[PDB]
Design a protein around this nucleic acid. Structure first.
Ligand SMILES: [Zn+2]
Ligand SMILES: [Zn+2]
Length: 620
RNA sequence: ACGAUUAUAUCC
RNA sequence: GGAUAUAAU
């Protein structure tokens, strides 16, 4: 299970790091790395956090959930080097057994077919520095590894300096030689909100980012997959790139119209970690569709920086905090320019193969019969593009409506490819949904909503406890009321646009809007401006948003007749609202709703003497 | 100091 | 077009 570094590929980098840190370079033999080649360590200062901050306005306005642990245990993640290392031991420090011969044959035939179909109406191309210069956020991370690279205070200042692009040229000229001297990953813990356990916040995932020079070189050679929308639903059939979250239910309802079995949406456990060097090499086949200088640069990124990664990660130790130089050949580095696009690719390929195994196209990994190989190639030819349309795929999240239900029990290939399902035994047959409105996708399910007009909407919907929990906490420490009042309204605005159809969220949302100064306009998470005459985001121009998104711009809404009142906008049926976590019918909820003006007036008085508006007469 | 890819709102 | 905020992979 040990990792075999190629020191002819990653060797010059590890050395350059060493040289810049000679006063501290040691070789800890207490290093915990069981499946990653460890190369050294040196001293460094801890970054990260594990605190969470209370949004007082929302917590005061959501009292019935105080008693609900699925709300109240929500916290920010632990991104300290402790939190990272736990995540590392649990998820990133693992090995996937190389797939069997049959599997590798299935994967290559399917990868090669896929790129030819993705390339029928697109052509790979280099991206431009001007293109990079316009896209990059101005405060995106510099991520400098070497001292030659730590000259700028922002990415904007950097891409407007000749000396930045001189560095980029030095590595660019190496890449065209087949060598790499400077592309090293940084590491951090994903800052997000997770349910805690036993009074401890938990880390979530790893985030790997190279420096801004390297990130351009990625973008130069592979950005075209994103910039030219290769994984659009139009181009790839299976993808859903570019569609927002509210529109995804419409994409699912269509998929459901196909004749087939149940609808399956099995999560893969730690997808990025389970990406194998075979995967990494099937993904590289896109270079077969490239040319000239472009082909060399794309090969350089793939072999020297994706299939040969030098990662630089923090580990707590008794003698302060240290920084390990570790290296892995396989795995997707979360934060590579190709993360979203190439997870969609490989997942498309995976599910297809799983579709094939259910249909009988091949009977066993380890061995692909000369005859069977012909049947696979002819199955893609015959039905492959249709099989792709039976799927909705967003990176590793996927929904597959297969031909029959033998899909559920077709798992030899999926497991051998390393794509182990989460929360189910390796060979436990799969759970499948016969009602598309209950299929999870991009952390939601989707309800068909009949309007008072008779028109139908499809709307996103999740367990309420999940949404209230997240509105009630925030980045930071301690408690806050004024500093996160506009943040509460932001959440309220989201509840009214996406989840207007949950009684509790629309009530809570009008409450938060009523309790927050109406003339305050957010300038950051914790700062704002005050306009003397204008209110911000009134219940009327909230309704303008609801129309603009759900009627005017909704391509599944042929009748563009607006709604004139918030009372026109319907709700889910009570039993469904209840099923999806609503508190109606509980006694705590009734009291909360009756005395809601009393709690609004508390928050008002706690905030101070500002200007307020009642958003509640939208529900009478 | 603050990844890539993306949707939406808002402010300019 | 940018920034801010939220959300998704
Ligand atoms: Zn390089
Ligand atoms: Zn629901």
């Amino acid at each position: 299970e040990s990792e075999t570094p190629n020191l002819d590929i990653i060797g010059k980098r590890i050395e350059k790091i060493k040289q810049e840190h000679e006063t501290s370079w040691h070789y800890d033999q207490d290093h915990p790395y069981k499946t990653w080649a460890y190369h050294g360590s040196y001293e460094t200062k801890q970054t990260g956090s594990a605190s969470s901050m209370v949004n007082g306005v929302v917590r005061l306005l959501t009292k019935p959930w105080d008693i609900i642990p699925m709300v109240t245990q929500m916290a920010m993640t632990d991104t300290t080097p402790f939190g990272q290392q736990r995540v590392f031991k649990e998820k990133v420090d693992t090995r996937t057994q190389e797939p069997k011969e049959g599997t590798k044959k299935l994967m290559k035939i399917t990868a090669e077919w896929l790129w030819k179909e993705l390339g029928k109406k697109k052509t790979p191309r280099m991206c431009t520095r001007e293109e990079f210069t316009r896209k990059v956020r101005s405060n995106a991370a510099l991520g400098a590894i070497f001292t030659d690279e730590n000259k700028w205070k922002s990415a904007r200042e950097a891409v407007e300096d000749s000396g930045f692009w001189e560095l980029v040229d030095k590595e660019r000229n190496l890449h065209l030689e087949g060598k790499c001297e400077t592309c090293v990953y940084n590491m951090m813990g994903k800052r997000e909100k997770k349910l805690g356990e036993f009074g401890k916040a938990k880390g979530s995932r790893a985030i790997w980012y190279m420096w801004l020079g390297a990130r351009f070189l990625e973008f130069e050679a592979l950005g075209f997959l994103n910039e030219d929308h290769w994984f659009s639903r139009e181009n790839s059939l299976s993808g859903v790139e570019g569609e927002g979250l509210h529109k995804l239910g419409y994409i699912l309802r269509d998929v459901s119209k196909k004749e087939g079995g149940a609808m399956y949406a099995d999560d893969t456990a730690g997808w990025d970690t389970r990406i194998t060097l075979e995967d990494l090499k099937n993904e590289e086949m896109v270079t077969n569709h490239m040319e000239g200088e472009h082909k060399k640069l794309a090969e350089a990124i793939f072999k020297l920086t994706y299939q040969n990664k030098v990662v630089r990660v923090q580990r707590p130790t008794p003698r302060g905090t240290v920084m390990d130089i570790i290296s892995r050949r396989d795995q997707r580095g979360s934060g590579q320019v190709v993360t979203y696009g190439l997870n969609t690719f490989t997942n498309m390929e995976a599910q297809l193969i799983r579709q094939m195994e259910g249909e009988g196209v091949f009977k066993s990994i380890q061995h692909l019969t000369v005859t069977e190989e012909i049947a696979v190639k002819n199955w893609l030819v015959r039905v492959g593009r249709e099989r792709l349309s039976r799927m909705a795929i967003s990176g590793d999240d996927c929904v597959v409506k297969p031909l029959d239900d033998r899909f559920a029990s077709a798992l030899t290939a999926l497991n051998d490819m390393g794509k182990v399902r989460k929360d189910i035994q390796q060979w436990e047959p799969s759970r499948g949904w016969n009602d598309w409105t209950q299929v999870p996708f991009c952390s939601h399910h989707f309800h068909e909503l009949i309007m008072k007009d008779g028109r139908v909407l499809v709307v996103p919907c999740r367990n309420q406890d999940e949404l209230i929990g997240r509105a009630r906490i925030s980045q930071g420490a301690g408690w806050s009321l004024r500093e996160t009042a506009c943040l509460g309204k932001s959440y309220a605005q989201m509840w009214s646009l996406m989840y207007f159809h949950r009684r509790d969220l629309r009530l809570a949302a009008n409450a938060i809007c009523s309790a927050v100064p109406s003339h305050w306009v957010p300038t950051s998470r914790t700062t704002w401006s005050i306009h003397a005459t204008h209110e911000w985001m009134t219940t009327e121009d909230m309704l303008t948003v609801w129309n603009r998104v759900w009627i005017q711009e909704n391509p599944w809404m042929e009748d563009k007749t607006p709604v004139e009142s918030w009372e026109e906008i319907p709700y889910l049926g009570k039993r469904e609202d209840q099923w999806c976590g609503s508190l109606i019918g509980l006694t705590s909820r009734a009291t909360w709703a009756k005395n809601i003006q009393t709690a609004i007036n508390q928050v008002r008085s706690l905030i101070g003497n500002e200007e307020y508006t009642d958003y509640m007469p939208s529900m009478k």
